[PDB]
């Protein structure tokens, strides 16, 4: 008995997978949003910094 | 952005012996993918043209590319990767249900028979066929050995 209810209680734990890569693909599409931010916002910052400079 | 909290050794337990490398990876990028969002904040700081108007003296052209930008359209990345992953999970919740039903049984099972050798009638008032009846194992077999005393002198 005691070995069939640990093993309940560890399928009850089974859904730790899931949420790991939903929190991984989470993550990554808020990392390439801020990437793709910093890129625009510097990239444009430095045309005017240019003009600045010469 | 609202993640879930995870443990690490939980984790582990429930991850079969043929995929634990990628379970590593996903623990590594998991590792990574915390760091990388802990060095950049969430928006950049939009400079002010006040800069950029009084120190330019080309001709209107911190305008429209300043006009450029507030109507930019940055692509917000899309999804198309949790939907199909969360139906893995639904699956998966199928399957673990189903096989808690069946140990379930087994513990019911368990529970019945153990509670039979629970309430055993004690051994002083036991015929050796009730006892044949409680420990199947004690009986002789005479199938192999059909005559007395029905077992291997040795057992004996």
Same mark, same amino acid.
């Given at each position: 008995?005691?070995?069939?209810?640990?093993?309940?209680?560890?399928?009850?734990? $089974?859904?730790?997978?899931?949420?790991?890569? $939903?929190?991984?693909?989470?993550?990554?599409?808020?990392?390439?949003? $801020?990437?793709?931010?910093?890129?625009?916002?510097?990239?444009?910052?430095? $045309?005017?910094?240019?003009?600045?400079?010469? | 952005?609202?993640?879930?909290?995870?443990?690490?050794?939980?984790?582990?337990?429930?991850?079969?012996?043929?995929? !634990?490398?990628?379970?590593?990876?996903?623990?590594?990028?998991?590792?990574?993918?915390?760091?990388?969002?802990?060095?950049?904040?969430?928006? *950049?700081?939009?400079?002010?043209?006040?800069?950029?108007?009084?120190?330019?003296? +080309?001709?209107?052209?911190?305008?429209?590319?300043?006009?450029?930008?507030?109507?930019?359209?940055?692509?917000?990345?899309?999804?198309?990767?949790?939907?199909?992953?969360?139906?893995?999970?639904?699956?998966?919740?199928?399957?673990?249900?189903?096989?808690?039903?069946?140990? !379930?049984?087994?513990?019911?099972?368990?529970? !019945?028979?153990?509670? +039979?050798?629970?309430?055993?009638?004690?051994?002083?008032?036991?015929?050796?066929?009730?006892?044949?009846?409680?420990? *199947?194992?004690?009986?002789?077999?005479? +199938?192999?050995? *059909?005559?007395?005393?029905?077992? *291997?002198?040795?057992?004996?």
């Amino acid at each position: 008995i005691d070995t069939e209810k640990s093993q309940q209680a560890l399928v009850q734990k $089974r859904h730790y997978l899931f949420d790991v890569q $939903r929190n991984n693909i989470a993550m990554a599409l808020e990392v390439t949003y $801020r990437e793709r931010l910093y890129r625009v916002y510097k990239e444009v910052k430095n $045309r005017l910094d240019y003009h600045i400079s010469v | 952005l609202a993640l879930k909290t995870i443990d690490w050794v939980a984790f582990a337990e429930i991850i079969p012996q043929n995929q !634990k490398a990628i379970a590593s990876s996903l623990k590594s990028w998991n590792e990574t993918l915390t760091s990388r969002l802990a060095a950049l904040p969430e928006n *950049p700081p939009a400079i002010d043209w006040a800069y950029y108007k009084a120190n330019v003296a +080309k001709a209107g052209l911190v305008d429209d590319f300043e006009k450029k930008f507030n109507a930019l359209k940055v692509p917000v990345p899309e999804d198309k990767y949790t939907a199909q992953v969360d139906a893995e999970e639904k699956e998966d919740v199928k399957s673990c249900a189903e096989w808690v039903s069946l140990s !379930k049984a087994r513990i019911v099972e368990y529970e !019945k028979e153990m509670e +039979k050798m629970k309430n055993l009638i004690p051994f002083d008032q036991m015929t050796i066929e009730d006892l044949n009846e409680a420990f *199947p194992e004690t009986k002789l077999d005479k +199938k192999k050995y *059909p005559y007395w005393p029905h077992q *291997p002198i040795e057992n004996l």
